[PDB]
């Protein structure tokens, strides 16, 4: 009667389907690296592996401060300098060593292949590395980072993973059985997206949050 | 030909502009799900379909309000539901803002609202009697109205907080990406923040579902 018990039981079941209120769940905080594109036209190093810009260092500082109070049990990054440098800022607040996994690299691009870049229409896949290959290597890398992180003393075990926009979007789309273009988003620099992980299950919990930049100066956002 | 960095950066800028990044005149809507009522409190003292926040919910709203205290905010709107009003009041109080109400932000009409048992539907099966695109329309109209009712910021980005409900917010955000129920397959955490970027009537979904201000909280608040 009254329909309240039915409502509450369904609410609980829905939460549990998305790993909310479920014991044994870990978190993966997928982080896009900070800016390395400001000044890239005049960069005097390898332009496909730049250091962070001045803007990027400021973003990484704000991100590191945001995550300083968050329980963090490991930090992983692709091998790119921009990801390493963003990851090092996060990790230094927690005394953690940054681990590298090449499977976290950005999708191969036209530029990597020595071809002109092209702006594609919405829904048209723009990269020479197939989407399925990106999704597989990204998922394997995240699973491995979780497995390499030991259970937190109390509460949720949490690993930060610093990667690259398109590979991170492909991963999160693929976890929802969606193809490139459906989850139609560019992840902000230094944004945080959260996966909830238990056993073979990876749930997309949140996507793209760079709200630590909201109060920042105009030359930083 | 030679060095492809300029071609790369020209395309990168064109992509950013499509999603309202690096574009002047963009405002933001911070879509917030209200704090807990149903998972935290033992008994219900008013309308079971429209409860006040639980003790857990009050704790979540405090952490949300602290998180947003340092963010420039220029308006706060909320559904009429008591749990949304209470959450909005906590946020607004750190900014000297008055909570405004728009009933078009109400949750989707449910089976329980119609007096019927609830059902856990298979993934992909819409569970509510109120039609999905009608929810999407009233939610997008309400957000448009809230942006229109917000005085412009004195500097930087104008930002309006909008406190609503999981399913109506997921419907809005899916609709803004041309997705139907079940494609954006997410439940928004209590007190989560999602951000829309808005310019000349266009709304872009920039972030979804963040309740990372609860990560450091005691386990009974999460
Ligand atoms: C929503 C979305 C659309 C994109 N479209 C393209 C595109 O049409 N062409 C391109 O070379 N690169 C693209 N990209 C890649 C971006 O322009 C940048 O190269 C990546 O953000 C760099 O990590 C797209 C990325 C996106 N996220
Ligand atoms: C991804 C997702 C699936 C949901 N499935 C159901 C559903 O199958 N039955 C229902 O009565 N309510 C649902 N709901 C509604 C949720 O149980 C309500 O929004 C709760 O308030 C969220 O905690 C769904 C919501 C979702 N977001």
B86/B55 Cα distance (integer angstroms): 12
DSSP state for residue A46 in the 8-state scheme: -
Residue A198: strand pairing partners = A201
Sign for the CA dihedral angle at A45, A46, A52, A56 comes to positive
CB contact under 8 A, A111 and B8: yes
The answer to whether the annotation marks B3 as part of a ligand binding site is no
HSE of A121, CA atoms in CB hemisphere, 13 A: 2
Query: Which helix (H) or strand (E) element contains residue B62?
Result: helix B55-69
Q: A4-43 burial by CB neighbour count: b if 16+ within 10 A, else e?
A: eebbeebbeebeeebbbeeeebbbbbbbbbbbbbeebeee
- Whether B69 and A211 have beta carbons less than 8 Å apart is answered as no
Tokens of B12: 């990168």
- The shortest C-alpha distance from B207 to chain A (Å) reads 5
B97/A168 Cα distance (integer angstroms): 37
φ, ψ of residue B78 to 5 degrees: the values are: -150, 155
Pairing relationship of beta strands A192-198 and A201-209 according to DSSP bridges: antiparallel
Please tell me whether residue A160 adopts helix, strand or coil conformation. strand
Please tell me whether residue A59 adopts helix, strand or coil conformation. helix
A96/B3 Cα distance (integer angstroms): 37
**Phi-psi group of B95: left, alpha or beta (phi > 0 → left; psi -120 to 50 → alpha; rest → beta):** alpha
* CB-closest option in B18, B156, B185 to A176: B185
Residue A158: strand pairing partners = A27
Q: Is A10 in the pocket of ligand 2 (CB under 6 A)?
A: yes
- Whether B94 and B68 have beta carbons less than 8 Å apart is answered as yes
Angle at A42 between CA A38 and CA A44, to 5 degrees: 110
Environment class of B48 (CB within 10 Å of its CB; exposed 0-12, middle 13-18, buried 19+): middle
- Whether B105 and B78 have beta carbons less than 8 Å apart is answered as yes
A28/A54 Cα distance (integer angstroms): 27
Experimentally determined by: X-ray
B174/B180 Cα distance (integer angstroms): 6
B9/B195 Cα distance (integer angstroms): 26
* CB-closest option in B38, B71, B210 to A209: B210
Tokens of B86: 């209470």
Question: How many other β-carbons are positioned within 10 Å of the β-carbon of residue A102?
Answer: 10
B101/B81 Cα distance (integer angstroms): 9
Please tell me whether residue A28 adopts helix, strand or coil conformation. strand
Distances, alpha carbon B81 to alpha carbons B88, B104, B178, in Å: 11, 11, 28
Please tell me whether residue A52 adopts helix, strand or coil conformation. coil
- Whether B14 and A119 have beta carbons less than 8 Å apart is answered as yes
The alpha helices in B26-54, defined as continuous H runs, are none
φ, ψ of residue A175 to 5 degrees: the values are: -65, -20
Which pairs from B43-48 meet CB under 8 Å and 24+ separation? B44/A4, B46/B82, B48/A2, B48/A4
**What does R_g of chain A's alpha carbons equal in angstroms?**
19
φ, ψ of residue A211 to 5 degrees: the values are: -70, -15
The answer to whether the annotation marks B137 as part of a ligand binding site is no
Strand B159-164: give its sheet, edge to edge. Answer: A98-100, A74-77, A158-163, A26-32, A192-198, A201-209, B202-210, B193-199, B27-33, B159-164, B75-78, B99-101
Residues of B whose CB is below 8 A from A7: 110-112, 118
B132-148 helix and B166-176 helix, angle to the nearest 10 degrees: 90
- Whether B209 and A206 have beta carbons less than 8 Å apart is answered as yes
Pairing relationship of beta strands A74-77 and A158-163 according to DSSP bridges: parallel
Q: How far is CA B209 from the centre of its chain?
A: 8
Ligand 2 centroid distance, CA of B126 (Å): 9
CATH 3.90.1150.10 holds for A24-213: no
Residues with their C more than 2.5 Å from the N of the next written residue in chain A, i.e. before a break, are none
The alpha helices in A54-206, defined as continuous H runs, are 54-68, 81-92, 131-148, 165-175
φ, ψ of residue B171 to 5 degrees: the values are: -60, -50
Residue whose CB lies within 8 A of the most ligand 1 atoms, among A180, A186, A193, for a mutation test: A186
Question: How many other β-carbons are positioned within 10 Å of the β-carbon of residue B180?
Answer: 14
Residue A134's contacts (CB-CB under 8 Å, 6 or more residues apart) are A107, A127, A166, A167, A170, A171
What's the helix, strand, coil split of chain A in %, to 5? 35, 15, 50
Ligand 1 centroid distance, CA of B177 (Å): 17
Q: Of how many residues is chain B composed?
A: 222
Tokens of B120: 């856990």
Q: Which ligand is nearest to the CA of A48?
A: 1
B206/A73 Cα distance (integer angstroms): 28
The answer to whether the annotation marks B199 as part of a ligand binding site is no
Q: A–B: how many Cβ contacts below 8 A?
A: 152
Distances, alpha carbon B133 to alpha carbons A3, A140, B31, B202, in Å: 26, 37, 18, 17
CATH superfamily entry for domain B26-214: Phosphoglycerate mutase-like (3.40.50.1240)
B43/A187 Cα distance (integer angstroms): 42
Please tell me whether residue B213 adopts helix, strand or coil conformation. helix
Q: Of how many residues is chain A composed?
A: 221
Distances, alpha carbon A53 to alpha carbons A50, A134, A217, in Å: 8, 27, 15
Question: DSSP string spanning B111-144?
Answer: TGGGT-----PPTTS---SS-HHHHHHHHHHHHH
B83/B190 Cα distance (integer angstroms): 11
**Measuring CA to CA, which residue among A37, A194, A54, A55 is closest to residue A106?**
A37
A60/A87 Cα distance (integer angstroms): 8
- Whether B179 and A123 have beta carbons less than 8 Å apart is answered as no
Instruction: Determine which residue's CA is closest to atom 4 belonging to ligand 2.
Output: A14
CB contact under 8 A, A7 and B112: yes
Ligand 1 pocket, CB under 6 A = A 106, 117-120, 126, 164-166, 169, 184-186; B 11-12, 15
Residue carrying structure tokens 């048209």: A124
- Whether A187 and A168 have beta carbons less than 8 Å apart is answered as yes
- Whether B82 and B52 have beta carbons less than 8 Å apart is answered as yes
Residues of A whose CB is below 8 A from B183: 176, 178, 182
Q: How far is CA A205 from the centre of its chain?
A: 12
The alpha helices in A50-108, defined as continuous H runs, are 54-68, 81-92
CB contact under 8 A, B193 and A208: no
**Where do the structural domains in chain B lie, given as residue ranges?**
26-214
């Amino acid at each position: 009667s009254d329909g309240r018990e039915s409502f509450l039981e369904v609410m609980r079941s829905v939460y549990e389907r998305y790993l909310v209120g479920v014991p044994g769940v870990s978190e993966v905080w997928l982080i896009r690296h900070a800016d390395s594109y400001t000044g890239l036209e005049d960069y005097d190093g390898d332009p496909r592996d730049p250091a962070l810009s001045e803007k990027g260092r400021a973003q990484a500082r704000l991100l590191a401060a945001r995550l300083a109070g968050v329980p963090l049990h490991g930090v992983w990054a692709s091998g790119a300098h921009r990801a390493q440098q963003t990851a090092s800022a996060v990790a230094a607040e927690h005394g953690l060593r940054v681990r590298t996994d090449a499977r976290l690299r950005e999708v191969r691009t036209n530029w990597d292949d020595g071809r002109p870049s092209e702006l594609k229409p919405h829904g048209v896949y723009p990269f020479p590395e197939p989407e399925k290959e990106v999704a597989e290597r990204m998922r394997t890398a995240v699973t491995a980072a979780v497995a390499a992180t030991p259970p937190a003393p109390d509460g949720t075990t949490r690993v930060a993973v610093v990667g690259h926009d398109s590979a991170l979007v492909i991963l999160m789309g693929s976890l929802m059985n969606l193809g490139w273009g459906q989850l139609d988003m560019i992840l902000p620099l230094t944004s945080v997206s959260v996966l909830a992980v238990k056993d073979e299950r990876m749930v997309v919990r949140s996507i793209g949050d760079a709200t630590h930049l909201a109060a920042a100066p105009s030359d930083v956002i």
